[PDB]
Design an enzyme around this catalytic site. Structure first.
Site, PDB file in Angstrom:
ATOM      1  N   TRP A   5       0.794  -1.210   0.000  1.00  0.00           N
ATOM      2  CA  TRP A   5       0.000   0.000   0.000  1.00  0.00           C
ATOM      3  C   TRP A   5       0.835   1.274   0.000  1.00  0.00           C
ATOM      4  CZ3 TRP A   5      -4.182   0.291  -2.465  1.00  0.00           C
ATOM      5  CH2 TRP A   5      -5.028  -0.849  -2.577  1.00  0.00           C
ATOM      6  N   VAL A 161      -7.922 -14.950  -1.930  1.00  0.00           N
ATOM      7  CA  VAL A 161      -6.783 -15.850  -2.171  1.00  0.00           C
ATOM      8  C   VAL A 161      -7.083 -17.132  -1.426  1.00  0.00           C
ATOM      9  CG1 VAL A 161      -4.320 -16.257  -1.511  1.00  0.00           C
ATOM     10  CG2 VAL A 161      -5.054 -14.042  -2.572  1.00  0.00           C
ATOM     11  N   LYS A 168       1.515 -14.888   1.050  1.00  0.00           N
ATOM     12  CA  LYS A 168       2.569 -15.089   0.060  1.00  0.00           C
ATOM     13  C   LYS A 168       2.664 -13.936  -0.941  1.00  0.00           C
ATOM     14  CE  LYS A 168       2.112 -20.109   0.516  1.00  0.00           C
ATOM     15  NZ  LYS A 168       3.397 -20.328   1.259  1.00  0.00           N
ATOM     16  N   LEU A 411     -21.836  -4.508  -2.492  1.00  0.00           N
ATOM     17  CA  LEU A 411     -22.392  -5.876  -2.360  1.00  0.00           C
ATOM     18  C   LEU A 411     -21.467  -6.862  -1.675  1.00  0.00           C
ATOM     19  CD1 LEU A 411     -23.922  -6.201  -5.887  1.00  0.00           C
ATOM     20  CD2 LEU A 411     -25.101  -5.355  -3.850  1.00  0.00           C
TER      21      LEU A 411
HETATM   22  C1  LIG Z   1      -7.735   2.156 -11.438  1.00  0.00           C
HETATM   23  C2  LIG Z   1      -8.196   0.729 -11.132  1.00  0.00           C
HETATM   24  C3  LIG Z   1      -7.706   0.303  -9.733  1.00  0.00           C
HETATM   25  C4  LIG Z   1      -8.123  -1.135  -9.413  1.00  0.00           C
HETATM   26  C5  LIG Z   1      -7.581  -1.623  -8.056  1.00  0.00           C
HETATM   27  C6  LIG Z   1      -8.201  -0.859  -6.899  1.00  0.00           C
HETATM   28  C7  LIG Z   1      -7.610  -1.404  -5.574  1.00  0.00           C
HETATM   29  C8  LIG Z   1      -8.381  -2.616  -4.981  1.00  0.00           C
HETATM   30  C9  LIG Z   1      -7.766  -3.183  -3.693  1.00  0.00           C
HETATM   31  C10 LIG Z   1      -8.526  -4.459  -3.265  1.00  0.00           C
HETATM   32  C11 LIG Z   1      -9.934  -4.171  -2.738  1.00  0.00           C
HETATM   33  C12 LIG Z   1     -10.576  -5.483  -2.275  1.00  0.00           C
HETATM   34  C13 LIG Z   1     -12.038  -5.303  -1.796  1.00  0.00           C
HETATM   35  C14 LIG Z   1     -12.500  -6.605  -1.231  1.00  0.00           C
HETATM   36  O1  LIG Z   1     -12.729  -7.564  -1.983  1.00  0.00           O
HETATM   37  S1  LIG Z   1     -12.686  -6.765   0.427  1.00  0.00           S
HETATM   38  C15 LIG Z   1     -12.847  -8.562   0.627  1.00  0.00           C
HETATM   39  C16 LIG Z   1     -11.424  -9.182   0.703  1.00  0.00           C
HETATM   40  N1  LIG Z   1     -11.446 -10.645   0.873  1.00  0.00           N
HETATM   41  C17 LIG Z   1     -11.392 -11.369   1.986  1.00  0.00           C
HETATM   42  O2  LIG Z   1     -11.311 -10.828   3.092  1.00  0.00           O
HETATM   43  C18 LIG Z   1     -11.411 -12.881   1.795  1.00  0.00           C
HETATM   44  C19 LIG Z   1     -10.535 -13.609   2.845  1.00  0.00           C
HETATM   45  N2  LIG Z   1      -9.145 -13.179   2.741  1.00  0.00           N
HETATM   46  C20 LIG Z   1      -8.359 -13.347   1.666  1.00  0.00           C
HETATM   47  O3  LIG Z   1      -8.758 -13.906   0.637  1.00  0.00           O
HETATM   48  C21 LIG Z   1      -6.952 -12.829   1.766  1.00  0.00           C
HETATM   49  O4  LIG Z   1      -6.560 -12.711   3.140  1.00  0.00           O
HETATM   50  C22 LIG Z   1      -6.729 -11.507   1.006  1.00  0.00           C
HETATM   51  C23 LIG Z   1      -6.956 -11.716  -0.498  1.00  0.00           C
HETATM   52  C24 LIG Z   1      -7.693 -10.415   1.488  1.00  0.00           C
HETATM   53  C25 LIG Z   1      -5.312 -11.002   1.231  1.00  0.00           C
HETATM   54  O5  LIG Z   1      -4.421 -12.049   0.854  1.00  0.00           O
HETATM   55  P1  LIG Z   1      -3.299 -12.513   1.926  1.00  0.00           P
HETATM   56  O6  LIG Z   1      -3.872 -12.423   3.313  1.00  0.00           O
HETATM   57  O7  LIG Z   1      -2.823 -13.812   1.453  1.00  0.00           O
HETATM   58  O8  LIG Z   1      -2.168 -11.380   1.910  1.00  0.00           O
HETATM   59  P2  LIG Z   1      -1.011 -11.236   0.748  1.00  0.00           P
HETATM   60  O9  LIG Z   1       0.299 -11.604   1.419  1.00  0.00           O
HETATM   61  O10 LIG Z   1      -1.403 -11.813  -0.588  1.00  0.00           O
HETATM   62  O11 LIG Z   1      -0.972  -9.659   0.652  1.00  0.00           O
HETATM   63  C26 LIG Z   1      -0.803  -8.799   1.774  1.00  0.00           C
HETATM   64  C27 LIG Z   1      -1.161  -7.381   1.363  1.00  0.00           C
HETATM   65  O12 LIG Z   1      -2.585  -7.294   1.044  1.00  0.00           O
HETATM   66  C28 LIG Z   1      -3.160  -6.297   1.873  1.00  0.00           C
HETATM   67  N3  LIG Z   1      -4.569  -6.614   2.092  1.00  0.00           N
HETATM   68  C29 LIG Z   1      -5.053  -7.543   2.953  1.00  0.00           C
HETATM   69  N4  LIG Z   1      -6.400  -7.543   2.859  1.00  0.00           N
HETATM   70  C30 LIG Z   1      -6.758  -6.628   1.920  1.00  0.00           C
HETATM   71  C31 LIG Z   1      -7.992  -6.206   1.382  1.00  0.00           C
HETATM   72  N5  LIG Z   1      -9.195  -6.712   1.803  1.00  0.00           N
HETATM   73  N6  LIG Z   1      -7.979  -5.248   0.439  1.00  0.00           N
HETATM   74  C32 LIG Z   1      -6.837  -4.700  -0.021  1.00  0.00           C
HETATM   75  N7  LIG Z   1      -5.641  -5.084   0.455  1.00  0.00           N
HETATM   76  C33 LIG Z   1      -5.582  -6.043   1.424  1.00  0.00           C
HETATM   77  C34 LIG Z   1      -2.350  -6.218   3.158  1.00  0.00           C
HETATM   78  O13 LIG Z   1      -2.558  -4.920   3.769  1.00  0.00           O
HETATM   79  C35 LIG Z   1      -0.971  -6.440   2.539  1.00  0.00           C
HETATM   80  O14 LIG Z   1      -0.477  -5.236   1.985  1.00  0.00           O
HETATM   81  P3  LIG Z   1       0.580  -4.341   2.816  1.00  0.00           P
HETATM   82  O15 LIG Z   1      -0.177  -3.876   4.121  1.00  0.00           O
HETATM   83  O16 LIG Z   1       1.821  -5.275   3.121  1.00  0.00           O
HETATM   84  O17 LIG Z   1       0.818  -2.984   2.063  1.00  0.00           O
HETATM   85  C1  LIG Z   2     -23.241 -12.990   9.085  1.00  0.00           C
HETATM   86  C2  LIG Z   2     -21.734 -12.858   8.748  1.00  0.00           C
HETATM   87  N1  LIG Z   2     -21.137 -13.575   7.774  1.00  0.00           N
HETATM   88  N2  LIG Z   2     -19.925 -13.237   7.748  1.00  0.00           N
HETATM   89  C3  LIG Z   2     -18.918 -13.809   6.794  1.00  0.00           C
HETATM   90  C4  LIG Z   2     -19.632 -12.305   8.665  1.00  0.00           C
HETATM   91  C5  LIG Z   2     -18.244 -11.735   8.864  1.00  0.00           C
HETATM   92  C6  LIG Z   2     -20.802 -12.017   9.365  1.00  0.00           C
HETATM   93  N3  LIG Z   2     -21.010 -11.153  10.424  1.00  0.00           N
HETATM   94  S1  LIG Z   2     -21.656  -9.639  10.241  1.00  0.00           S
HETATM   95  O1  LIG Z   2     -22.982  -9.807   9.631  1.00  0.00           O
HETATM   96  O2  LIG Z   2     -21.672  -9.088  11.608  1.00  0.00           O
HETATM   97  C7  LIG Z   2     -20.520  -8.853   9.103  1.00  0.00           C
HETATM   98  C8  LIG Z   2     -20.787  -8.844   7.725  1.00  0.00           C
HETATM   99 CL1  LIG Z   2     -22.310  -9.231   6.980  1.00  0.00          CL
HETATM  100  C9  LIG Z   2     -19.884  -8.431   6.777  1.00  0.00           C
HETATM  101  C10 LIG Z   2     -18.584  -8.106   7.140  1.00  0.00           C
HETATM  102  C11 LIG Z   2     -17.642  -7.755   6.162  1.00  0.00           C
HETATM  103  C12 LIG Z   2     -16.273  -7.935   6.380  1.00  0.00           C
HETATM  104  C13 LIG Z   2     -15.392  -7.645   5.340  1.00  0.00           C
HETATM  105  N4  LIG Z   2     -15.817  -7.094   4.191  1.00  0.00           N
HETATM  106  C14 LIG Z   2     -17.105  -6.944   3.938  1.00  0.00           C
HETATM  107  N5  LIG Z   2     -17.393  -6.517   2.655  1.00  0.00           N
HETATM  108  C15 LIG Z   2     -18.791  -6.313   2.210  1.00  0.00           C
HETATM  109  C16 LIG Z   2     -18.838  -5.473   0.940  1.00  0.00           C
HETATM  110  N6  LIG Z   2     -17.981  -6.052  -0.110  1.00  0.00           N
HETATM  111  C17 LIG Z   2     -16.551  -6.107   0.327  1.00  0.00           C
HETATM  112  C18 LIG Z   2     -16.369  -6.904   1.641  1.00  0.00           C
HETATM  113  C19 LIG Z   2     -18.058  -7.266   4.911  1.00  0.00           C
HETATM  114  C20 LIG Z   2     -18.297  -8.122   8.498  1.00  0.00           C
HETATM  115  C21 LIG Z   2     -19.221  -8.527   9.460  1.00  0.00           C
HETATM  116 CL2  LIG Z   2     -18.713  -8.534  11.118  1.00  0.00          CL
END
Ligand SMILES: CCCCCCCCCCCCCC(=O)SCCNC(=O)CCNC(=O)[C@H](O)C(C)(C)COP(=O)(O)OP(=O)(O)OC[C@H]1O[C@@H](n2cnc3c(N)ncnc32)[C@H](O)[C@@H]1OP(=O)(O)O
Ligand SMILES: Cc1nn(C)c(C)c1NS(=O)(=O)c1c(Cl)cc(-c2ccnc(N3CCNCC3)c2)cc1Cl
Length: 411
Positions: A5, A161, A168, A411
């Site tokens: 970031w 991921v 990673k 969403l």
């Molecule tokens: C002009 C067009 C632009 C388009 C792009 C716009 C930007 C969009 C950006 C994305 C918007 C997404 C919106 C949504 O979908 S929010 C929903 C995100 N998904 C989840 O939470 C699902 C469960 N978790 C995972 O799948 C993984 O833990 C993820 C994929 C989240 C990270 O994989 P992993 O845990 O294996 O880590 P790494 O080693 O590969 O990478 C570590 C780096 O990633 C940074 N990190 C962690 N979480 C997030 C996060 N939610 N947004 C942005 N960055 C995040 C973290 O600070 C670190 O960077 P730094 O702190 O070292 O700097």
């Molecule tokens: C019922 C339930 N199921 N799950 C999986 C969880 C976490 C809950 N508990 S929750 O309802 O109280 C709630 C909810 Cl819905 C959502 C998130 C959350 C976290 C991260 N990101 C988003 N984004 C939504 C918009 N798009 C990008 C990602 C939402 C956190 C909480 Cl804490």
């Protein structure tokens, strides 16, 4: 520190965000010709894959990845289970760009490993009202108005991921490749939300929850029986009583939205969303796409009395997998979507949302404190949860705003 970031065109600290007075880009103006035509490099054992989000199998493949590896709570009790029909709806709106749906697979056996998706949005993202006032006071109206016109940008979602590939540094590569594919299309901003705190949100709101099936919510430990209820002889009976709802909507003339409703619904929605600093602009095609009823996905009702549509509400369905409980497999959650009220108070409109959602078998109604969602919290018995949704831009400097100045549902 933020190894990734820190390299990106986003505000780096809250202190920096406080010095932002006008909306505008962070980075150097660049051209499509400046952008690499070759995909971002990736390890030789991996490959980029572009799934077709209209094609049932490809949708099913992405669905499985998200089902097994997407957002969980911290105690690994719940995991989002967006349906196949939901994913096709969210990711293929009008004029969507197939190339913005980006996956990684393992080359050898094609194991699916990661996903990120962009969709177009037309967004009002000009200097917010309170900052335009400061600009007038200082004779800086012109700089403050520079980016008032709604912009065609990217909304990013479903970054994921595989659990086996966490920590990673794969997420940054996905983000770089999505940025590249978007920039090749001459789009230079994005909007995204996350539950986690990253550098640096322009707005943040708490989640709120309205219990519809409290017995099940307590059973699965989404809720507990609050201390106060232990003074009763039957705490759960009183809790059920507290949350009881009518079995049929109360508003005269409530009915499901039809294609003919699109122009009126567009009118009343756009009029309403104008009052907010950051909000989408929707064409008729986009109103149809995002609001017309789709079974199991989005539910939309209009108040039509005497042949005129005066109000409407919408909610969408995301079930969460109940990981640890043996008795239930899913938590069926309804999420407050867009709405507009012109004839009745907002609380009266949204009560019918709760009624419909409850009748249809939803367990809880969720929302973020955006729009005017605060205006009905207490009367309709929503409670704040522990979650927060943070709102971010990529490559856009923006003054901090309250969540009640945000009109973009994510969403
Ligand atoms: C002009 C067009 C632009 C388009 C792009 C716009 C930007 C969009 C950006 C994305 C918007 C997404 C919106 C949504 O979908 S929010 C929903 C995100 N998904 C989840 O939470 C699902 C469960 N978790 C995972 O799948 C993984 O833990 C993820 C994929 C989240 C990270 O994989 P992993 O845990 O294996 O880590 P790494 O080693 O590969 O990478 C570590 C780096 O990633 C940074 N990190 C962690 N979480 C997030 C996060 N939610 N947004 C942005 N960055 C995040 C973290 O600070 C670190 O960077 P730094 O702190 O070292 O700097
Ligand atoms: C019922 C339930 N199921 N799950 C999986 C969880 C976490 C809950 N508990 S929750 O309802 O109280 C709630 C909810 Cl819905 C959502 C998130 C959350 C976290 C991260 N990101 C988003 N984004 C939504 C918009 N798009 C990008 C990602 C939402 C956190 C909480 Cl804490």
């Amino acid at each position: 520190a933020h190894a990734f970031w820190s390299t990106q065109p986003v505000p780096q600290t809250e202190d920096e965000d406080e010095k932002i007075v006008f909306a505008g880009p962070m980075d150097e103006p660049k051209t499509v010709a400046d952008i690499p035509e070759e995909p971002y490099p990736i390890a030789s054992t991996f490959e980029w894959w572009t799934p077709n989000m209209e094609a049932a199998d490809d949708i099913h493949a992405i669905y499985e990845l998200l089902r097994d590896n997407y957002v969980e709570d911290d105690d690994s009790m719940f995991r989002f289970n967006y349906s196949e029909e939901f994913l096709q709806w969210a990711l293929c709106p009008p004029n969507y760009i197939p190339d913005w749906h980006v996956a990684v697979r393992r080359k050898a056996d094609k194991k699916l490993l990661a996903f990120i998706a962009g969709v177009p949005v037309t967004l009002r993202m000009g200097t917010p009202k309170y900052m335009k006032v400061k600009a007038q006071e200082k004779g800086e109206g012109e700089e403050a108005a520079k980016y008032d016109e709604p912009r065609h940008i990217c909304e990013i979602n479903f970054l994921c991921v595989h659990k086996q590939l966490r920590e990673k540094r794969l997420a940054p590569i996905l983000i770089k490749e999505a940025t590249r594919r978007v920039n090749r299309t001459n789009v230079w901003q994005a909007v995204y939300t996350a539950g986690v705190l990253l550098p640096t949100p322009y707005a943040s709101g708490q989640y709120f929850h309205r219990s519809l099936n409290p017995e099940k919510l307590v059973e699965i430990r989404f809720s507990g029986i609050p201390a106060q209820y232990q003074k009763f002889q039957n705490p759960m009976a009183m809790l059920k009583r507290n949350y009881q709802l009518p079995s049929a909507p109360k508003n005269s003339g409530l009915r499901e939205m039809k294609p003919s409703d699109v122009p009126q619904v567009r009118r009343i929605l756009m009029n309403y969303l104008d009052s907010f600093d950051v909000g989408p602009v929707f064409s008729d095609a986009e109103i149809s796409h995002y609001l017309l009823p789709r079974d199991g996905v989005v539910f939309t009702y209009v108040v039509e009395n005497d042949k005129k549509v005066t109000d409407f509400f919408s909610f969408y369905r995301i079930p969460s997998t109940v990981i640890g409980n043996s008795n239930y497999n899913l938590l069926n959650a309804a999420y407050v979507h867009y709405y507009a009220a012109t004839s009745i108070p907002l609380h009266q409109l949204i009560l019918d949302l709760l009624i419909v959602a409850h009748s249809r078998g939803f367990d809880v109604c969720n929302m973020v404190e955006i729009l005017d969602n605060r205006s009905f919290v207490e009367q309709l018995k929503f409670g704040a949860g522990d979650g927060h949704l943070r709102y971010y831009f990529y490559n856009w400097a923006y003054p901090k705003i309250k969540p009640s100045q945000v009109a973009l549902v994510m969403l």
